[PDB]
Amino acid sequence: METATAGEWQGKGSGGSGGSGGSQDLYATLDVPAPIAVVGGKVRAMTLEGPVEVAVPPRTQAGRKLRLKGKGFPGPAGRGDLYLEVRIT
């Protein structure tokens, strides 16, 4: 895994795997303020046990989301995935 607690956005960082679908999944919100969105800083993502923190790309708009593998609910088959809708506030 990378040093970052998050994978990719949806192409940004690296086109790892463009495929939204799985199980044991979670729906959350990425709270990105308009300043951090423009400059491309970092923001927190709500997760199970603790928080994630992703590097926001410069000048991000809302309606995007993170796809995070192993950040959805813990299950007897391992863990699920976490899709969290980006808001620019």
CB atoms closer than 10 angstroms to residue 5 = 17
Rounded Cα gap, residues 2 and 64, in angstroms: 21
- Burial class, 54, CB count within 10 angstroms (exposed 0-12 / middle 13-18 / buried 19+): buried
Token reading at 39:
């400059």
What is the chain written as a DSSP string? --SSSS-BSSSSS---------SS-EEEEEEE-HHHHHHT-EEEEE-SSSEEEEEPPSS--TT-EEEEEEEEEEETTEEEEEEEEEEE-
Phi, psi of 10 (to 5 degrees): -170, 35
Parse the chain into domains and list their residue ranges.
27-88
- Report yes or no: 89 and 42 within 8 Å, Cβ to Cβ: no
Token reading at 21:
């679908």
Rounded Cα gap, residues 69 and 80, in angstroms: 7
- Report yes or no: 45 and 53 within 8 Å, Cβ to Cβ: yes
Deposited experimental method: NMR
What CATH code is assigned to 27-88?
Answer: 2.60.260.20
